[PDB]
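Structure first, sequence second, as always.
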């Protein structure tokens, strides 16, 4: 992706978007009890912790585009992945408006807590002014969609979240694009059945983990991924994507039966218009992280990418023996023979992708079931039930999280959620976590599950 044009919003008649400038994150009551290094991301140019130019830093992810046609490797990659997806009988029929908005099996109701985007954010109109869970009213929504139409600018927010010392200093805050409510709804109608099928079938046929429950899905992954593990990391995957990868996505969608017109919404993602505070800008390429479908579309593109790279380096690869699961940029994969990830990474550079050794590793090719991570979690087979696999979120990350809160009124839900992650690190680690929580009075006011209870429910869940 490449920013092609930026100018002051007032020159095009857009008001300044007043997005948050101060973090909602504050030190929690557990901030001194546990150790941590992370701090809220920089949200503004004048942050005194900045050691770099903020606006340059947050847009530096747009590293450019490789301008190329869909080549012979991409074409075969699209064919192979499309053949897998054909197995799932995805419907390209529009999803019914009430199902696409208020919920259906495989597609949770549109989030009423996130931004309604443009123009609503300039008019003081929130999602709850248009929609209502209890009545499922569509009349105000149909009104707004007729009135303002589709293909509206995306509103760029800076993500309010904890970041490492390095990312605070470098100003490397992440951005979220808010599609307008109108475009969100329209894309959920167009692609809702695809979203549903992916959510209901995480695994190696979709090549997708979007929507998975790690407590369950982890024991399936080693069954699905039979051979020598493949993994690597991307740097700025979403923003690095060139238009050619969106053309590949459009080709695969057409193979699934979408019409050319129905794939037009991919052009809205690729060649995109954005409002950021007092500026507006156009990007050629880049997945706008935040719009409808971006995790699923990122995952589908990743399925095309990795196949392309393997076909290009290993002519004579057999993709029917290849397996992979993606969550956006994150990938865990396998092949029955060893594969040199450093070769794939160089092939990726030629397509404008930045691939590095997994988990900030020194070198490629050192991936095992002991050291591999996916969705930030390690894999640990249960000692007693060896066919069940614990997802293991590092205690370090749980400690970082518990030390901050965006709203102490949610302490019970926050700490409980962390307990559901922590106990997979083992009983001694879990008891120590609970002991430290209870060393603050709030901690003794919380309903905390016992280790044996968490283990019993996990075992029973299968």
């Amino acid at each position: 992706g490449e920013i092609e044009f930026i100018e002051s919003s007032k020159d095009a008649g857009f008001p300044v978007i007043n997005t948050p400038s101060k973090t909602k994150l504050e030190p929690s009551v557990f901030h001194q009890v546990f150790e941590g290094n992370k701090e809220p991301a920089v949200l503004r140019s004048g942050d005194p912790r900045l050691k770099a130019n903020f606006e340059e830093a947050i847009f530096s992810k747009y590293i450019g585009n490789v301008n190329t046609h869909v080549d012979e490797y991409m074409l075969e990659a699209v064919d192979h992945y499309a053949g897998q997806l054909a197995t799932l009988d995805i419907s390209t029929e529009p999803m019914k408006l009430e199902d696409a908005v208020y919920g259906t099996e495989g597609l949770e109701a549109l989030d009423l807590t996130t931004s309604a985007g443009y123009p609503y954010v300039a008019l003081g109109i929130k999602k709850r002014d248009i929609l209502s869970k209890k009545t499922k009213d569509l009349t105000k929504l149909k009104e707004c969609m007729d009135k303002y139409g589709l293909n509206l600018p995306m509103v760029t927010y800076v993500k309010d979240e904890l970041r490492s010392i390095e990312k605070v200093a470098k100003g490397k805050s992440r951005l979220i694009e808010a599609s307008s409510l109108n475009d969100s709804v329209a894309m959920r109608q167009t692609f809702g059945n695809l979203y549903k099928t992916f959510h209901l079938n995480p695994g190696v046929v979709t090549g997708s983990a979007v929507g998975c429950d790690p407590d369950l899905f982890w024991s399936k992954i080693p069954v699905m991924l039979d051979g020598h593990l493949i993994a690597f990391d991307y740097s700025g995957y979403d923003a690095s994507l060139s238009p050619v990868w969106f053309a590949c996505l459009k080709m695969i969608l057409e193979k699934l039966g979408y019409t050319h017109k129905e794939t037009n919404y991919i052009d809205y993602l690729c060649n995109s218009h954005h409002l950021y505070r007092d500026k507006h800008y156009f990007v050629r390429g880049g997945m706008p992280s935040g719009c409808s479908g971006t995790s699923i579309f990122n995952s589908m593109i990743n399925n095309i990418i990795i196949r392309t790279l393997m076909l290009k380096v290993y002519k004579g690869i057999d993709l029917d023996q290849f397996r992979m699961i993606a969550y956006g940029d994150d990938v865990i994969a396998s092949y029955p023979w060893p594969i040199d990830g450093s070769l794939l990474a160089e092939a990726g550079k030629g397509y404008g992708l930045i691939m590095t050794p997994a988990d900030k590793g020194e070198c490629f090719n050192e991936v095992t079931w002991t050291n591999v991570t996916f969705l930030k979690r390690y894999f640990r087979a249960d000692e007693q039930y060896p066919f069940l696999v614990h997802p293991v979120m590092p205690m370090k990350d749980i400690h970082e999280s518990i030390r901050w809160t965006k709203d102490p009124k949610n302490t019970q839900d926050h700490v409980r959620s962390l307990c559901l992650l922590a106990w997979h690190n083992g009983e001694h680690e879990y008891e120590e976590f609970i002991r430290k929580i209870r060393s603050v009075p709030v901690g003794r006011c919380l309903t905390l599950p016992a280790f044996s209870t968490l283990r019993r429910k996990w075992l029973d869940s299968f």
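Margin note: The chain has 18 helices and 16 strands.
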